[PDB]
């Protein structure tokens, strides 16, 4: 019952990690989804800042990765991705985190290629009229600031429930001195209502708001505005039948609303290509449903369902007179639509339970994606002017079935499991991957005219051990891409223009972990994490895959106190592919290894409180990660300059639980 701070997440059991993202994680994370995932073997990040990171798993990038929030997705409108995913996520409001590694499930949407992110709040439940309620504080070096507040009433038949955080810090300095452009503000508030009819019955409710501002040291441009607004409809009914165990509904809708500038966090580069005040404003309206039924009877869980998603992406931008210099902000001006897409899914996965010790799963699903071009005009051509756009109003279209087979062992000497898997996905192309590229593949029209789908087929493999004083994990994948979707970068008069083609790659790599009790106060563990990637139709490797890494974790306890230290060791990146990458990064040097060592500590004080401090960086290391991105040089980055890491950091936090 000794508390601890979290400096590293096993595989509970095979391909899948579950998390709860509100124990304190040594590596201090800012607030978006990506920094809570760096505590788990597998994951990389693309620093932009300070906040909002760009997750990248087992080599992978973007959509590959299958991130929603309590079943349903919110996406991005920023077309480099400054406002991705993660960044609309604060995992403090969620209590449970859970991945699934690969291509290995169908019942949480298409093209899951690389592994699906699961951030969910979970149903409240009264033995009678009661109200629980969580709240915690969190003060750090630069500013670092981060409050967070759970609260529940109920009774037998319903509840109410809220969350809400507020976080925020300023520039961080790196470990040679140096202020890092990268403050950021987020606040979240969520509701839900909750009526609980008769104990085999749910409806809920939820609404939330949400806002944000960061500043960005390896962009041209910072996130003024990260508003989001929220409604969802969730509906369960359990013991149908005696076969039919559950059925379950649900409604989203997720409206993103973003702006990026370049003069209220920071003012304009005089030598820049924008060295006025530009903004651009962009939203994402999206909505979505699922509607699933579990059936079990005899050995076998089955999961039958649905799903549906349609979202809607428009612009804007500012007009800017460079001798009235009368600038007209972007918000009178009328909205530009210039995309939507539609999904239509119907899955299911099956679960055989034969005997004690053997387990065989398997999954498909029949996805039906489509999407429609209304930009009438490209800013392509002489300095870029509008051009007539060659795809305007076209609809392009595709039926793309998925699945996997897994089947897991248990050995009879030992508390062995072994496991191995067979997966194949393929994924529409993305927003980013049809719409940003300023170029398509030679000879295109455009990009969303010739971008095919990327199909990748994959195998997956590992094991379990948990042993008395012994817990280990390990976990592979070797797997080809068709098709794997590759941005490349050029410069030429205006800028440095992207281009997206679709070529054909080999990838591998792994995880393992073990953590060992020496004795009763003694704790040892760590972990390691590889990936590898090659581009078959050039004989090179693969862009922006994240240099070989382990971590060792050492802790003492005695039941109401905790100490560990913990060592974090990065190998370099020779494995490059100098400029291509994806729509927010390119490779263009070799890294640099590296050591990063650091300290925490937790105290139960009493029931309901406990404290946790740490620093991070012990040792003031100055370094910089290999995925991460150039500065902007209006901030004085130079060459090729990544961003750098943070140097020595110090935090604290007290949990509060009444």
Request: net charge negative.
């Amino acid at each position: 019952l000794a508390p601890s701070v979290v400096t590293g997440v096993a595989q509970s059991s095979p391909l899948t990690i579950v998390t709860n993202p509100k124990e304190p994680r040594q590596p201090v994370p800012a607030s978006d989804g990506a920094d809570y995932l760096k505590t788990i073997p597998g994951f990389a990040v693309i620093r932009n800042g300070g906040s909002n990171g760009d997750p990248v798993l087992r080599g992978m990038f973007g959509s590959r990765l299958n991130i929603l929030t309590n079943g349903g997705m919110m996406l991005g409108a920023a077309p480099n991705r400054m406002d991705a995913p993660t960044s609309y996520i604060s995992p403090e409001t969620y209590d449970k985190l859970t991945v699934i590694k690969g291509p290995q499930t169908v019942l949480w949407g298409p093209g899951a290629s690389a592994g699906t992110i699961l951030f969910e709040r979970e149903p409240e439940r009264f033995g009678e009229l009661g109200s629980r309620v969580n709240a915690s504080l969190l003060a750090g070096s630069n500013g670092r600031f981060d409050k967070v507040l759970d609260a529940a009433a109920g009774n037998r038949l319903g509840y109410l429930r809220f969350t809400g955080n507020h976080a925020q810090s300023d520039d961080y300095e790196d470990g040679a001195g140096n202020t890092v452009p990268s403050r950021w503000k987020k606040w979240n508030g969520d509701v839900a209502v909750g009526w609980t009819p008769d104990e085999d019955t749910l409806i809920e409710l939820t609404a939330g708001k949400g806002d944000g501002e960061a500043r960005y040291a390896g962009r041209g441009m910072d996130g003024s505005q990260f508003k989001r607004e929220s409604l969802g409809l969730r509906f369960v009914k359990s013991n149908v039948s005696d076969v039919l165990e559950k059925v379950e509904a649900q409604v989203y809708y997720n409206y993103a609303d973003h702006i990026m500038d370049n003069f209220r966090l920071r003012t304009p580069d005089p030598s820049s290509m924008m060295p006025m005040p530009m903004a651009s404003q962009v939203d994402r309206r999206t909505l979505g449903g699922r509607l699933a039924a579990t059936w079990r009877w005899d050995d076998f869980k089955l999961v039958t369902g649905v799903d549906a998603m349609r979202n809607e992406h428009r612009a804007r931008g500012s007009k800017y007179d460079m001798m009235t210099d009368y600038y007209t902000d972007a918000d009178q001006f009328p909205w530009s639509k210039d995309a939507v897409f539609h999904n239509y899914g119907a899955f299911g996965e099956l679960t055989w339970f034969a005997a004690e010790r053997d387990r065989l799963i398997g999954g498909l699903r029949l996805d039906r994606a489509s999407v429609k071009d209304y930009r009438q005009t490209l800013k392509s051509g002489h300095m870029g002017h509008a051009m007539a756009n060659p795809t305007a109003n076209d609809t392009r279209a595709d039926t793309l079935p998925s699945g996997f087979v897994r089947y897991e062992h248990d050995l009879a000497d030992s508390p062995t499991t072994l496991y191995a898997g067979l997966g194949h996905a393929e994924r529409f192309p993305d927003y980013w991957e049809l719409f940003s590229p300023k170029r398509g593949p030679n000879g295109s029209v455009n990009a969303f005219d010739k971008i095919k789908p990327e199909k990748t087929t994959q195998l997956d493999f590992g094991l379990q051990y948990n042993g008395d004083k012994l817990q280990a994990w390990a976990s592979g994948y070797v797997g080809v891409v068709q098709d794997f979707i590759l941005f490349s970068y050029r410069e030429g008069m205006m800028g440095s223009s992207t281009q997206a083609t679709n070529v054909d790659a080999r990838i591998m790599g792994g995880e393992l972990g073990a953590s060992y009790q020496l004795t009763g106060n003694w704790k040892t563990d760590a972990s390691l994490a590889y990936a590898w990637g090659k581009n078959s139709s050039d004989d090179r490797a693969l862009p922006q895959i994240p240099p070989l890494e382990a971590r060792f974790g050492l802790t003492y306890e005695e039941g109401d106190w905790s100490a560990g230290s913990l060592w974090r060791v990065v190998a370099p990146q020779n494995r490059i592919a100098r400029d291509q990458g994806n729509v927010v990064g390119k490779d263009f040097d070799k890294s640099a290894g590296f050591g990063v060592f650091s300290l925490n500590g937790a105290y139960r004080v009493t029931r309901n409180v406990k404290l946790s401090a740490g620093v991070d960086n012990l040792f003031d290391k100055d370094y910089t990660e290999h995925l991460n991105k150039a500065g902007d040089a209006g901030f004085g980055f130079s060459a090729n300059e990544t961003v750098p890491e943070p140097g020595r950091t110090f935090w604290t936090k007290v949990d509060f639980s009444f």
